[PDB]
Amino acid sequence: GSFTKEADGELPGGVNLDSMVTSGWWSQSFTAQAASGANYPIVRAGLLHVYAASSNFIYQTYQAYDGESFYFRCRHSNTWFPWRRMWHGGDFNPSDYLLKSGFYWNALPGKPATFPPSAHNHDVGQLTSGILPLARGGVGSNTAAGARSTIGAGVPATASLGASGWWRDNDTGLIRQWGQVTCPADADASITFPIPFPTLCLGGYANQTSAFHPGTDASTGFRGATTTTAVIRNGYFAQAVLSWEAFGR
Amino acid sequence: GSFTKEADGELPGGVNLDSMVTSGWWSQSFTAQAASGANYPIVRAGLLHVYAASSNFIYQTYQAYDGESFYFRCRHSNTWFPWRRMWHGGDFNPSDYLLKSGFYWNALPGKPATFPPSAHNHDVGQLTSGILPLARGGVGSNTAAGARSTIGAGVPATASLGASGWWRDNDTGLIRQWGQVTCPADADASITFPIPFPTLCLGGYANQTSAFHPGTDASTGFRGATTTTAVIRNGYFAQAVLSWEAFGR
Amino acid sequence: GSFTKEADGELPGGVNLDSMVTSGWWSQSFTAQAASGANYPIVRAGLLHVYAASSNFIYQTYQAYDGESFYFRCRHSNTWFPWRRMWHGGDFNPSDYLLKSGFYWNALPGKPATFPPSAHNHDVGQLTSGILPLARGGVGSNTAAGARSTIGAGVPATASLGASGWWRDNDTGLIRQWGQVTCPADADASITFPIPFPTLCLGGYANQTSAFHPGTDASTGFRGATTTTAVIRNGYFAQAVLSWEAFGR
Ligand SMILES: [Mg+2]
Ligand SMILES: [Mg+2]
Ligand SMILES: [Mg+2]
Ligand code: NI
């Protein structure tokens, strides 16, 4: 015969679709009657088409009644290929899946603003704020005075160490000075310090530089100092050169 | 009847596909005649198949003439399920979409070579170049002399503070020295400095250490110094011990 | 006629599917006979359906015998549209492809725990361990004594520079002291040092502060020192004020 406008028949329960090898179309009206059968592509009421092209080729299609999908298969040399199941718009939408073209760094959302760094070295120049403390090998200040304070350092003494000169301890302000003066016999001579004492002279002394006669007085005196001058007294009966020292601040 | 080699008919305009409930196949020759109708799966000329399996099941397929897609649906207990639309090769190609297997760090393109780091601490040991300046709590040099210069520090004085000894200010080079010497009556005695002055002796003095007789001269003298020796003159009429001091550089 | 339960015929080799413009269904039993033909959707044995809707519309479907896929096309005004090829479950599974919803940072696998950082500055406060060495502008210690050692620094001298006072070099321990004392004529007077020498007095001297008569002895003496006192001898025949200096440690 031919394919008719009426279906060839209704599939009852327990139909093995492998046995439907005659051309036509058949309706399965009941999902449960599909469940109780065999080789249904999906447990679902549906429409089956059979095209028995030849003994060696039996083609079948199945349209699920609820649009679950549409299936097809074929029997080639007494072996049924598996049912193919169509993909349709009720399964998935491609727009929901990431294109390879949308897979790159700047497109990836949720990226942290900052990243936990690995082991890196720095140059000192990238220290741009803060003052390194002593506990870290620093000097705990950004001033010279403050640095010394942190590490208990003093300042350099200064001096001019000439034949007549001075020496100054800048930690405390102490100045010490020296010079020579020719004195008249049994008399005074004034000296002028190489530099002035900023505040006052605290003391001095004088010393006979010559091979004075040991049978007579050769005393010395340091007195009447100012910030700039002092009086050296020579107790030797001849004119003589006396050296002196003086200190102050 | 049966499905014929000729189509059952041409669909004109204004056809509600819900009304095509008789088995057969019908052609819509004009996209616009689909537009003017109802329940077409797509506004597009196409081929419609109707399989009226039973009163309760009416199956339909629609093949768009331009291959837009292929559609199917069914009427179950007087309600039409929605049209299913097939996915085909003209819609998309899976090769353009990212597999889950190709979603990992090393595959992600456009990754920066370096990343903005978050708050991290360092150990000092990862400072491997540069010289920390004073403005940062550093000493602004990698030399001892250069460090002191930055912070205005002096160097330690050195000394040997024995009964006879010396003291040296290494900031300026000033050396001061002391000792004792037994002198003959009314005569000279030579002393040798604990260390030699590197350059010259700048001055000295001597002092009577004994309870000399106050009814006679007991003068002192320091003279004729070299880098290593000096002459101490004793103006007392007895042999006596005189202490001395001397300074230089 | 009508579509029959028997296929209209077997397609031999060398069939141009463009020529199959009569309604019916035909079977290609041999993949190689498809290879030797034209306009087959796939080189594969299969079932062909032709629906000659009208002169202007010829619809075709092709079901591959091995389920490779299912194809359809149409001839509109003497031009064949391309074959559409169905996507099915044997081609791909959507579950293997990444959803846009699963494309974010925390989902991306294989992320490194740490990231190579870019150029950043630090505040000194994020140095939280280690001691900066001199080679980096540090002081190579976390102690004051150790810092000075690294950079060769000395400590501050201390002093009290009053009319009678003292000065101490704390690098070496040397103390120097000064004062004045009224002495009886031709006699001794005891002095007490402004501070005690911690260990011993190493030396001293005295100096006549007055305009003594140059026709008589005005000698001086420093002797018998302890840590706290000394004896100043005045060789002048009048009572007189003598200044002194003393040093020790
Ligand atoms: Mg004499
Ligand atoms: Mg006398
Ligand atoms: Mg005299
Ligand atoms: Ni860092």
Q: Please state, in angstroms and as integers, the Cα–Cα distance from residue C82 to each residue in A248, B65, B204, C85, C247, following that order.
A: 114, 11, 122, 9, 117
Q: Which of C72, C191, C209, C241 is best to mutate for the A interface (most A CBs within 10 A)?
A: C209
Cβ of B1 within 8 Å of Cβ of A5? The answer is yes
User: Which tokens belong to A43?
Assistant: 């447990």
Query: In terms of CA atoms, which chain A residue is nearest residue B93?
Result: A94
Residues of A in contact with C90 (CB under 8 A): 82, 84
Cβ of B76 within 8 Å of Cβ of A66? The answer is yes
For residue B138, the CA-to-ligand 1 centroid distance in Å is: 64
Residues contributing to the annotated binding site of A for Ca(2+): 186, 214, 217, 235
| Distance from C-alpha of C239 to C-alpha of C229, rounded to nearest angstrom | 20
User: Which tokens belong to A5?
Assistant: 């406008």
| Distance from C-alpha of B140 to C-alpha of A3, rounded to nearest angstrom | 102
| Distance from C-alpha of C42 to C-alpha of C71, rounded to nearest angstrom | 9
Cβ of A223 within 8 Å of Cβ of C210? The answer is yes
Three-state secondary structure of C87-116 = CECCCCCHHHECEHHHCCCCCCCCCCCCEC
| Distance from C-alpha of C18 to C-alpha of C58, rounded to nearest angstrom | 10
CA A160-A166-A168 angle, 5° bins: 95
Per-position DSSP letters for B155-184, written without gaps between them: PPPEEE-SSSEEEEETTTTEEEEEEEEEE-
From the list B69, B148, B167, the residue facing C172 with the nearest CB is: B167
**In this structure, what are the phi and psi dihedrals at residue A135, rounded to the nearest 5 degrees?**
-60, -15
From the list B23, B102, B137, the residue facing A140 with the nearest CB is: B137
Q: What does the CA dihedral A103, A105, A107, A109 come to, rounded to 10 degrees?
A: 110
Closest CA to C104 of A107, B114, B100: A107
Question: Contact, C144 vs A147, CB < 8 A?
Answer: no
Spatial CB neighbours of A93, under 8 Å, sequence gap ≥ 6: none
User: Which tokens belong to B9?
Assistant: 């008919």
Question: Contact, C232 vs C181, CB < 8 A?
Answer: yes
Report the residue count for chain A: 249
| Distance from C-alpha of C161 to C-alpha of A170, rounded to nearest angstrom | 13
Cβ of B113 within 8 Å of Cβ of C116? The answer is yes
In eight-state DSSP terms, residue A149 is H
CA B211-B213-B215 angle, 5° bins: 150
Q: What does the CA dihedral C170, B247, B188, C209 come to, rounded to 10 degrees?
A: -80
In eight-state DSSP terms, residue A170 is T
Question: Contact, A127 vs C121, CB < 8 A?
Answer: yes
Strands of B4-96 (E only): list them. 9-10, 24-28, 46-54, 57-64, 70-76, 79-80, 84-85
For residue A149, the CA-to-ligand 4 centroid distance in Å is: 30
Could you identify the residue written with the tokens 């339909």? B60
- CATH 2.60.40.3940 location in chain B: 159-248
User: Which tokens belong to A167?
Assistant: 């020496």
For residue A46, give the H/E element and its range.
Answer: strand A46-54
Q: Chain B: list its partners (3+ Cβ pairs within 8 Å).
A: A, C
By the 10 Å C-beta count (0-12 exposed, 13-18 middle, 19+ buried), A177 is classed as buried
Could you identify the residue written with the tokens 């260390």? B195
Sign of the CA dihedral running A188, A192, A198, A202: negative
Closest CA to B100 of C125, A155, C107: C107
Q: Count other C-beta atoms under 10 Å from residue C238's C-beta.
A: 14
| Distance from C-alpha of B45 to C-alpha of B29, rounded to nearest angstrom | 5
| Distance from C-alpha of C62 to C-alpha of A38, rounded to nearest angstrom | 26
In eight-state DSSP terms, residue A141 is -
In eight-state DSSP terms, residue B100 is G
What are all long-range contacts of C28-37, with beta carbons under 8 Å and residues at least 24 apart?
C29/A53, C29/A54, C29/A56, C29/A57, C37/C11, C37/C13
Question: Contact, A226 vs A177, CB < 8 A?
Answer: no
User: Which tokens belong to A41?
Assistant: 């592509």
Question: Contact, B176 vs B207, CB < 8 A?
Answer: no
Chain A: closest CA distance from residue B162 (Å): 23
Spatial CB neighbours of A126, under 8 Å, sequence gap ≥ 6: C119, C120, C121, C122
Spatial CB neighbours of A240, under 8 Å, sequence gap ≥ 6: A182, A183, A185, A208, A209, A210, A212, A218, A234
Q: Please state, in angstroms and as integers, the Cα–Cα distance from residue B202 to each residue in A181, A238, B248, C65, C169, following that order.
A: 14, 24, 5, 122, 21
User: Which tokens belong to C107?
Assistant: 């989902």
Q: Please state, in angstroms and as integers, the Cα–Cα distance from residue B33 to each residue in A221, B37, B43, following that order.
A: 139, 7, 9
In eight-state DSSP terms, residue B83 is P
CA A72-A74-A80 angle, 5° bins: 115
| Distance from C-alpha of B27 to C-alpha of C5, rounded to nearest angstrom | 23
| Distance from C-alpha of A158 to C-alpha of C144, rounded to nearest angstrom | 24
**In this structure, what are the phi and psi dihedrals at residue A94, rounded to the nearest 5 degrees?**
-55, -30
Q: Which three-class secondary structure state does DSSP give residue B79?
A: strand
For residue A134, the CA-to-ligand 4 centroid distance in Å is: 21
Report the residue count for chain B: 249
- Please report which ligand is nearest the Cα atom of A184: 3
Closest CA to B153 of C167, A171, A161: A171
In eight-state DSSP terms, residue B15 is -
CATH of B159-248, one of 3.30.70.3170, 3.90.1300.10, 3.90.550.10, 2.60.40.3940: 2.60.40.3940
Query: Does B186 carry a binding-site annotation?
Result: yes
Could you identify the residue written with the tokens 């291959």? B67
Residues of B in contact with C172 (CB under 8 A): 156-159, 161, 167
> Identity (one letter) of the amino acid at A9?
G
Cβ of A134 within 8 Å of Cβ of C140? The answer is no
Cβ of C203 within 8 Å of Cβ of B153? The answer is no
Q: Please state, in angstroms and as integers, the Cα–Cα distance from residue A115 to each residue in B30, B111, C10, C116, C118, following that order.
A: 61, 13, 69, 9, 10
Spatial CB neighbours of C84, under 8 Å, sequence gap ≥ 6: B67, B69, B70, B88, B89, B90, C71, C72, C73
| Distance from C-alpha of A66 to C-alpha of B75, rounded to nearest angstrom | 9
- The β-bridge partners of A88 are B86
Task: Report the half-sphere exposure of A53 (CA within 13 A, side-chain side).
Answer: 29
Per-position DSSP letters for chain C, written without gaps between them: -B-BSS-SEE--SS-BGGG--SSEEEEE--HHHHHTSBS-SSSS-EEEEEEEEETTEEEEEEEETT-S-EEEEEEETTEEPPPEEB-BTTT--GGGB-BGGG-STTT-TT--SSB-B-S--EEGGGEEE----GGGTS-S-SSHHHHHHHHT--PPPEEE-SSSEEEEETTTTEEEEEEEEEE-TTEEEEEE-SS--SS-EEEEEEEE-S---TTS---EEEE---SSEEEEEE-SSS-EEEEEEEEE-
Question: Contact, B136 vs C134, CB < 8 A?
Answer: no
Residues contributing to the annotated binding site of C for Fe(3+): 120, 122
Residues of A in contact with B128 (CB under 8 A): 121-123
By the 10 Å C-beta count (0-12 exposed, 13-18 middle, 19+ buried), C188 is classed as middle
Cβ of C152 within 8 Å of Cβ of B154? The answer is no
Q: What does the CA dihedral B12, B15, B21, B22 come to, rounded to 10 degrees?
A: -10
Question: Contact, A50 vs A24, CB < 8 A?
Answer: yes
Spatial CB neighbours of A103, under 8 Å, sequence gap ≥ 6: B98, B102, B103, B108, B109, C103
From the list B142, B205, B207, the residue facing C135 with the nearest CB is: B142
User: Which tokens belong to A183?
Assistant: 């004195």
For residue B122, the CA-to-ligand 4 centroid distance in Å is: 7
Question: Contact, B71 vs B62, CB < 8 A?
Answer: yes
